[PDB]
Design an enzyme around this catalytic site. Structure first.
Site, mmCIF file in Angstrom:
data_model
loop_
_atom_site.group_PDB
_atom_site.id
_atom_site.type_symbol
_atom_site.label_atom_id
_atom_site.label_comp_id
_atom_site.label_asym_id
_atom_site.label_seq_id
_atom_site.Cartn_x
_atom_site.Cartn_y
_atom_site.Cartn_z
ATOM 1 N N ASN A 61 0.933 -1.310 -0.047
ATOM 2 C CA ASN A 61 -0.097 -0.021 -0.104
ATOM 3 C C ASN A 61 0.924 1.152 -0.017
ATOM 4 O O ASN A 61 2.063 1.591 0.646
ATOM 5 C CB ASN A 61 -1.156 0.120 1.298
ATOM 6 N N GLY A 87 -0.888 7.097 1.489
ATOM 7 C CA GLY A 87 -0.247 8.278 1.897
ATOM 8 C C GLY A 87 -1.194 9.241 3.002
ATOM 9 O O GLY A 87 -1.256 10.470 2.609
ATOM 10 N N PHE A 88 -1.587 8.389 3.817
ATOM 11 C CA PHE A 88 -2.337 9.151 5.017
ATOM 12 C C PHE A 88 -3.641 9.811 4.666
ATOM 13 O O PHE A 88 -3.853 11.082 4.884
ATOM 14 C CB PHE A 88 -1.660 10.082 5.740
ATOM 15 N N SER A 115 5.388 5.456 8.674
ATOM 16 C CA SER A 115 4.988 5.146 7.395
ATOM 17 C C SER A 115 5.972 5.297 6.341
ATOM 18 O O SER A 115 6.642 6.323 6.247
ATOM 19 C CB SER A 115 3.710 6.309 6.939
ATOM 20 N N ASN A 126 5.121 6.048 3.445
ATOM 21 C CA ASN A 126 4.533 6.672 2.304
ATOM 22 C C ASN A 126 4.178 8.232 2.356
ATOM 23 O O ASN A 126 3.444 8.727 1.812
ATOM 24 C CB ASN A 126 2.997 6.199 2.083
ATOM 25 N N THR A 127 4.965 8.961 3.406
ATOM 26 C CA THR A 127 4.974 10.161 3.427
ATOM 27 C C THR A 127 6.607 10.534 3.541
ATOM 28 O O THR A 127 7.193 10.216 4.635
ATOM 29 C CB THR A 127 4.311 10.866 4.801
ATOM 30 N N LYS A 186 5.395 4.132 16.980
ATOM 31 C CA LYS A 186 5.578 3.032 16.309
ATOM 32 C C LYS A 186 6.600 3.283 15.338
ATOM 33 O O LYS A 186 6.687 4.197 14.446
ATOM 34 C CB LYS A 186 4.217 3.098 15.587
ATOM 35 N N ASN A 217 5.969 -1.245 11.639
ATOM 36 C CA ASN A 217 5.003 -0.700 10.454
ATOM 37 C C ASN A 217 5.326 -1.742 9.242
ATOM 38 O O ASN A 217 5.978 -2.762 9.384
ATOM 39 C CB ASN A 217 5.354 0.718 10.237
#
Ligand SMILES: Cc1cc2nc3c(=O)[nH]c(=O)nc-3n(C[C@H](O)[C@H](O)[C@H](O)COP(=O)(O)O)c2cc1C
Ligand SMILES: COC(=O)/C(C#N)=C1\SCC(=O)N1c1ccc(-c2ccccc2)cc1F
Ligand SMILES: O=C(O)c1cc(=O)[nH]c(=O)[nH]1
Length: 365
Positions: free
Chosen positions: A114, A117-118, A184, A186-187, A224, A253
């Protein structure tokens, strides 16, 4: 059970065959939010209860962040048999996240990649949604069913720590625990928040805001972390967490790595990988963080849990509690009672009086 087999062999493959994974997820949130679930015959025994983070947890298996990003399905997730629910990640302002498609199934690997992107309804929307059920949650928490809130940062934010601080002030009063998600994949720049001087700066600010809440509304704060950290990063995190008295760690994560052997056609999509191929990398991360913290910092273990054995491996490596997400996408709701039943059987087979006795057991061998 017959439900475990029906979901695993007929229903979930049929939904996967009919729907792209984001559609399927949206439909699952909806169904869950309405309680349209097989409903859990499994009755939690005493041996599954854990006390940690200033709470009672009726069983140690939680839903990981990302399934219920906006706090829409909390009650349904307890009905599914989760001992605790974490929502989020929630960003300060609403934001749409990345363009679609942004999540991909790797069925041959029992994995997902995935890059959402929040996507987030934002703090104010989530605050009012939790307020509408605040007392119902207080009673759930008291009965051993706590609520965690996972905080993220907006894509265009000019001060990351202030994004987290705002989250603490807004949702802290409604959570049993907060998560500073600095992992994450994705950021852009987010995972850099895991380095030393700046982790310490960030977490001091977060803790100061948490400590400024009224006592009954003051949550535990956990950090996390990613499964991709260097030895140095892990040592730095352990040192900061002990120095500031952070309440716990969530490990891990998703991974930006692509382990050798992935077969799915979509293996080279950008994003974080979850599910079976992450499992042992996460377990090993737990093991290292438990040793580095001397066993004094509670760990919520997550990544690739789909059975009681997987859960127990993480518990014996140092986790006090575990979470799962990706397994649901493949096995559906019956997987929760399966993990719990298997874990209970294993604890008895391995001579543990309950979960608590198993926590960190591999480090005492
Ligand atoms: C679709 C998807 C979205 C996620 N979004 C979030 C998120 O918003 N915040 C977060 O901390 N973790 C998020 N995660 C990570 C999960 O919480 C979990 O750490 C990871 O997927 C490993 O567990 P699993 O193998 O059981 O899925 C997401 C995972 C997936 C698969
Ligand atoms: C047309 O769709 C269904 O019938 C679903 C769904 N989705 C049903 S029927 C009874 C039931 O239980 N679900 C359901 C609910 C949630 C999930 C689910 C939950 C979390 C993550 C992924 C899927 C899967 C399901 F099949
Ligand atoms: O929103 C996402 O892309 C997301 C966030 C996160 O923390 N982890 C993840 O795998 N995806």
């Amino acid at each position: 059970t017959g439900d475990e087999r029906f979901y695993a062999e007929h229903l979930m493959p049929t939904l996967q065959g009919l729907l792209d994974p984001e559609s399927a997820h949206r439909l699952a949130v909806r169904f869950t939010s309405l309680g349209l679930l097989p409903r859990a015959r499994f009755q939690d025994s005493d041996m599954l209860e854990v006390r940690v983070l200033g709470h009672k947890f009726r069983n140690p298996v939680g839903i990981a962040a990302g399934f219920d990003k906006h706090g829409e399905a909390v009650d349904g997730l307890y009905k599914m048999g989760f001992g605790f629910v974490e929502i989020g990640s929630v960003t300060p302002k609403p934001q749409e996240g990345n363009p679609r498609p942004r999540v991909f199934r790797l069925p041959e690997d029992q994995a997902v990649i995935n890059r959402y992107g929040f996507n987030s309804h934002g703090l104010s929307v989530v605050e009012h949604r939790l307020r509408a059920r605040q007392q119902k949650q207080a009673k759930l928490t008291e009965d051993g069913l706590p609520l965690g809130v996972n905080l993220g940062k907006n894509k265009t934010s000019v001060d990351a720590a202030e994004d987290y601080a705002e989250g603490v002030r807004v949702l802290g009063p409604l959570a049993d625990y907060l998560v500073v998600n600095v992992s994450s994949p994705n950021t852009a720049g987010l995972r850099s928040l895991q380095g030393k001087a700046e982790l310490r700066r960030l977490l001091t600010k977060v803790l100061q805001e948490r400590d400024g809440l009224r006592r009954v509304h003051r949550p535990a704060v956990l950090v996390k972390i990613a499964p991709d950290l260097t030895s140095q990063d892990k040592e730095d995190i352990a040192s900061v967490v002990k120095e500031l008295g952070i309440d716990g760690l969530i490990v891990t994560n998703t991974t930006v790595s692509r382990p050798a052997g992935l077969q799915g056609a979509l293996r080279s999509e950008t994003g974080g990988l979850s599910g079976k191929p992450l499992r042992d990398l996460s377990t090993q991360t737990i093991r290292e963080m438990y040793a580095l913290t001397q066993g004094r910092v509670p760990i919520i273990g997550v990544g690739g849990v789909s059975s009681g054995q997987d859960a127990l491996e993480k518990i014996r490596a140092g986790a006090s509690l575990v979470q799962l997400y990706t397994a649901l996408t493949f096995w559906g709701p019956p997987v929760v009672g399966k993990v719990k039943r298997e874990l209970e059987a294993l604890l008895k087979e391995q001579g543990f009086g309950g979960v608590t006795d198993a926590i960190g057991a591999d480090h005492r061998r």
